[PDB]
Nucleic acid binder design. Structure first.
Ligand SMILES: NC(=O)c1nc(F)cn([C@@H]2O[C@H](COP(=O)(O)OP(=O)(O)OP(=O)(O)O)[C@@H](O)[C@H]2O)c1=O
Ligand SMILES: [Mg+2]
Ligand SMILES: [Zn+2]
Ligand SMILES: [Zn+2]
Lengths: 826, 63, 114, 28
RNA sequence: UUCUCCUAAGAAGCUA
RNA sequence: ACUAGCUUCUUAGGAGAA
């Protein structure tokens, strides 16, 4: 029977399944050792593997572990979709049943550490030695040294074990007095916010053998890698403290007489407690900058609003700024009957037709915004494998090495469309136009200098969009405050623009689909990849269930372009403002203020590029997990065996940025796993033989990585695999493709779903009911979007463009060439 | 057949919302539920069975 | 200059919705700790006199707001009013298991600190 | 507002369903 | 005066 | 009645050519 081993030799390295000296006398004192001449069937490495390589049809190990440790009975697995987290959230509890067990192992590990420290023994703590009860064995690779000076190696152990610490909530007992589940919850003093001593106590109690120094407050970190490490720890150490202790730290400030309440800090769940630097108690004759920061500060708002208890959502509410709850509903889209009769009169919407109207402007009742914001309950605190994360962040920054970024002045901003809202605490007096025409350049520069040394919490107003959809969800938008997005632009609009103006890259934000651009992108993805197959995925609820750690990783990768214009303190305070504004900030539904658990706001200035960083992170992570989860003695190519060995060595045996192997692995991926990433959509051309042997990512690897790291189960309905390259990507940005002849050369054209363009034709969201001229350009744009359907083999699909043409004819762009010159490269 | 009932239900909830039906959440919720249930309908039987209910909700008032 | 106008309006809002903030509760919960630093999530949890619970259904009304007085955040609240998501007053006797499907689902109960 | 009611009525009459017809005769 | 290109304003469509 | 990207239509400005 195959057993999960964390093997590392001079010939094979990796955490994968394998088909398989008088030192024991110096360790019998510690109770964390088995009696060597008793054991359990499954070791802890088996649990970590089955929970990090989770797939269907082969999850028998996880099932036999869950039904053997009193987690859920055998008739709990007959239920369909018992493993998903979005659907069936009760599995969380079924996982938490293992948590305490895991915690015991942790404590036993520390005991063993002290034993190896007292007995003076060196050696690696391999996961396949610790029993699921908590006992260690197999003392064959340990060297005896002077007693009192031998140290063990726990890098690989704790690193591989970190995900299941927050997946099963092994630290759920630290909320109970005397650390026992049979005791009441620790009545933490409401005024306690520091928790630094408690974090250090938990670290010394669970990770005493952790060699790298850990700072509970991340302001004391050394580099971005140190911030990632310490935040990955604080993620686990913040699941034990009262959830009402985090968030912005406020105090009474004295403003020209009457006192105010101003936030002079922020106790993040990942970045420890971060105090403001440019603070002053006696403030008189404040300027417009400080007044705007105080308005956007939730300190003033939540300090004078009625305490709120919203049982509708499990999210931690804060207050209600308005004396009555606002129930905003989504109206149904107006109907354009002219186009509908024009379509039915030309042989459309018939019985059994291949094209059928499926996209509608769905209406939603007064429980739309709240019940959709409640989808954040899928955002669970996730402790990522910190060595794996610290290497994947390097490979990901290598994926972003071609661009160039840095802090820009306020006069060189390229902000567009100043006719949109500016968050909650400012939309009562105007749009972003007023706040961009009022603050002069020195005011915006001073505000950016302020957010470069402080933390400015903001209130991202959650509004309901009015767009078409093929599903019944509400799909709310999160309008961030103007104070947050202004600084985010000044800090990021040099790297974002450079991503939006670079072709042939992995990130295809900014690259147009028109003028043969789709062919450019597809041929770039192909890029002479041997044995090519295409693969695509769409992250289930990426806006909600994205962990805080990977969002911090994304913001750090996006901030790695300031190696000259920003200090370490400046970069950390910018990351803190990011976390306090777009990661765990407090949102506003109607007039009621809640605390977003951990979701990544979809309204951030840098939402698309940060989501692209996160997608590349997940893809590189799937690649490294597939490369490590393969038997080294079975890989035929010796170069790939050496690559996997050096990968394990750079992960769980090294601590510096091995730029040599970082670049080597980046080249290996970009030559064997070529990605096209638009912010959640990813089309990868990968090698057939490599994925079949397991040397690159696949569908199963992405599913497993999303299971243990992203905390969602990627259903097979949102992923796809294209075998032949003649047919392009089955879907990218909901734009199917096909190889069509246009100018004596077979190119690729993006054709949307005919149902979508038909629904855009018939149903109107209060646009055409005002005038008849807007219909003209609206249908011109729809024909531009729907032209490629003509080259489709199905005639019912092709007639959509002809129908749109015949409708534009009666204007009272007509030619079928203004919609074909959109796809000739020029 | 299906497109006709879907489109008339769309315009029906449009005129309902214009009839200040959103001022009564108990009824607006049922209207919205019927709307979103028939917009995903795959059989004409259930589509009509819910369209008649939406129509009865419409004619309940003198509009 | 609309900048001065928006500054005046925003300062007016700042100074107007700051009245109902001080009831000698912040000065108790701020000066009793070191550094005078207090988390925001406990500022309205310990100083807001008025409270409102938004109950989705009676099954969660009986569990939390059972009777004319209920405990929350280590304090007692006497239910002062109830609204049925339409600005229509709902009397306390109207809430019942039998008369459950005759009102709006989210019931906004407004209570005062005892 | 009248245009929407008229187009709704015309679409309902174009539907010409038995149950819808009984409903529209009971309403009128 | 005509054509082409690049910017400023408004409106619209699609994508994430 | 959010962020970013692309693409249209209509008014103006600046350049190159005829
Ligand atoms: N500001 C907006 O108006 C906005 N609108 C969208 F439709 C999408 N985004 C961003 O793109 C991602 C969607 O990714 P996407 O693949 O479409 O999946 P989803 O998160 O929308 O959920 P689902 O797959 O169930 O539909 C979201 O996470 C969000 O960050 C937006 O910012
Ligand atoms: Mg896709
Ligand atoms: Zn650190
Ligand atoms: Zn910088």
């Amino acid at each position: 029977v195959y057993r999960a081993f964390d093997i590392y030799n001079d010939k094979v390295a990796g955490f994968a399944k394998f088909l398989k000296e008088t030192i024991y006398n110096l360790l019998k004192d510690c109770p964390a050792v088995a009696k060597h001449d008793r054991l359990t069937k499954y070791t802890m490495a088996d649990l970590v593997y089955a929970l990090r390589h989770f797939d269907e049809g082969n999850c028998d190990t996880l099932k036999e572990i869950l039904v053997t440790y009193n987690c859920c009975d055998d008739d709990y697995f007959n239920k369909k979709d018992w493993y998903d987290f979005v659907e069936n959230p009760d599995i969380l509890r079924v996982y938490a049943n293992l948590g305490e067990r895991v915690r015991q192992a942790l404590l036993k590990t520390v005991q063993f550490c002290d034993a190896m420290r007292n007995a003076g023994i060196v050696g690696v703590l391999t996961l396949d030695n610790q029993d699921l009860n908590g006992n260690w064995y197999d003392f064959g690779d340990f060297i005896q040294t002077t007693p009192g000076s031998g140290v063990p190696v726990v890098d690989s152990y704790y690193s591989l074990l970190m995900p299941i610490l927050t997946l099963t909530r092994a630290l759920t007992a630290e909320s109970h007095v005397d650390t026992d589940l049979t005791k009441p919850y620790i009545k933490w003093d409401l005024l306690k916010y520091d928790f630094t001593e408690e974090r250090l106590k938990l670290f010394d109690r669970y990770f005493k053998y952790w060699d790298q120094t850990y700072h509970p407050n991340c302001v004391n970190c050394l580099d971005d890698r140190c911030i990632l490490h310490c935040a990955n720890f604080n993620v686990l150490f913040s699941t034990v403290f009262p959830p009402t202790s985090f968030g912005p730290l406020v105090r009474k400030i004295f403003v020209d007489g009457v006192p105010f309440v101003v936030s002079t800090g922020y106790h993040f769940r990942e970045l420890g407690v971060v105090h403001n630097q440019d603070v002053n108690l006696h403030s008189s004759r404040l300027s417009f900058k400080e007044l705007l920061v105080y308005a956007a500060d939730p300190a003033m708002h939540a300090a004078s609003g009625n305490l709120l208890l919203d049982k509708r959502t499990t999210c931690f509410s804060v207050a209600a700024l308005t004396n009555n709850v606002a129930f905003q509903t989504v109206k149904p889209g107006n109907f354009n009957k002219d186009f509908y009769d024009f379509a039915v009169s030309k042989g459309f919407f018939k019985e059994g037709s291949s094209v059928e109207l499926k996209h509608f402007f769905f209406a939603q009742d007064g429980n739309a915004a709240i019940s959709d914001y409640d989808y954040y309950r899928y955002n669970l605190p996730t402790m990522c494998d910190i060595r794996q994360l610290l290497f994947v962040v390097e490979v990901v920054d290598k994926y972003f090495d071609c661009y160039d970024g840095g802090c820009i002045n306020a006069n060189q901003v390229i902000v567009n469309n100043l006719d949109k809202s500016a968050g909650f605490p400012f939309n009562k007096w105007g749009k972003a136009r007023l706040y961009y025409d009022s603050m002069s350049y020195e005011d915006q520069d001073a505000l950016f200098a302020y957010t470069k040394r402080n933390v400015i919490p903001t209130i991202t107003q959650m509004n309901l969009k009015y767009a078409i959809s093929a599903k019944n969800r509400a799909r709310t938008v999160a309008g961030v405050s103007i104070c947050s997005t202004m600084t985010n632009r000044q800090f990021h609009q040099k790297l974002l623009k450079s991503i939006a103006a670079t072709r042939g890259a992995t990130v295809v934000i900014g690259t147009s689909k028109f003028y043969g651009g789709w062919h450019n992108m597809l041929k770039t993805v192909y890029s002479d990849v041997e044995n090519p197959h295409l693969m695509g995925w769409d992250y289930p609820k990426c806006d909600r269930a994205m962990p805080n750690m990977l969002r911090i990783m994304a913001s750090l990768v996006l901030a790695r372009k300031h190696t000259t214009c920003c200090s370490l303190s400046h970069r950390f305070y910018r990351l803190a403002n990011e976390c306090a504004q777009v990661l765990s900030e407090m949102v506003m539904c109607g007039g009621s203020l809640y605390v977003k658990p951990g979701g990544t706001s979809s309204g951030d200035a840098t939402t698309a590029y940060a989501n692209s960083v996160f997608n590349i992170c997940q893809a590189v992570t799937a690649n490294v997990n597939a490369l490590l989860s393969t038997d080294g003695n079975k890989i035929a190519d010796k170069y790939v065996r050496n690559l996997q060995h050096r990968l394990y060595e750079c992960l769980y045996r090294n601590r510096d940025v091995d730029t040599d192997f970082v670049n080597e692995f980046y080249a290996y991926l970009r030559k064997h796993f070529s990605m096209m990433i638009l912010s959640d959509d990813a089309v990868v051309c990968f090698n057939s033989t490599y994925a079949s042997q397991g040397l690159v990512a696949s569908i199963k690897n992405f599913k497993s990585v999303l299971y243990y790291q992203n905390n969602v189960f990627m259903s097979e309905a949102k992923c796809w695999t294209e075998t032949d390259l003649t047919k392009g990507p089955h879907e990218f940005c909901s734009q199917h493709t096909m190889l069509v002849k246009q100018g004596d050369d077979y190119v690729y054209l993006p054709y949307p779903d005919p149902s979508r363009i038909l629904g855009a034709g018939c149903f109107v969201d209060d646009i055409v009911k005002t005038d008849g001229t807007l219909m003209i350009e609206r249908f011109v744009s729809l024909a531009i979007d729907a032209y490629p359907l003509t080259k489709h083999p199905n005639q019912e699909y092709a007639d959509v463009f002809h129908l749109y043409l015949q409708y534009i004819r009666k204007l009272h762009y007509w030619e079928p060439e203004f919609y074909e010159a959109m796809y000739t490269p020029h | 057949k299906m497109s006709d009932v879907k489109c008339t239900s769309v315009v029906l909830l449009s005129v309902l919302q214009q009839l200040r039906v959103e001022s009564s959440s108990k009824l607006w919720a049922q209207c919205v539920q019927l709307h979103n249930d028939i917009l995903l309908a795959k059989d004409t039987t259930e589509a009509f069975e819910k369209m008649v209910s939406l129509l009865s909700v419409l004619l309940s008032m003198q509009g | 200059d609309k900048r001065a106008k928006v500054t005046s309006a925003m300062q007016t809002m700042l100074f107007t919705m700051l009245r109902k903030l001080d009831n000698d509760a912040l000065n108790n919960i701020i000066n009793n700790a070191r550094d005078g630093c207090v988390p925001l999530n406990i500022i309205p949890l310990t100083t807001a006199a008025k409270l409102m619970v938004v109950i989705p259904d009676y099954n969660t009304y009986k569990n939390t707001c059972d009777g004319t007085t209920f405990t929350y955040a280590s304090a007692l609240w006497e239910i002062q009013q109830v609204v049925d998501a339409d600005s229509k007053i709902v009397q306390l006797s109207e809430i019942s298991m039998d008369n459950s499907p005759n009102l709006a689902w989210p019931l906004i109960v407004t209570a005062l600190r005892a | 507002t009248s245009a929407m009611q008229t187009m709704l009525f015309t679409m309902l009459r174009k539907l010409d369903n038995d149950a819808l017809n009984n409903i529209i005769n009971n309403a009128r």
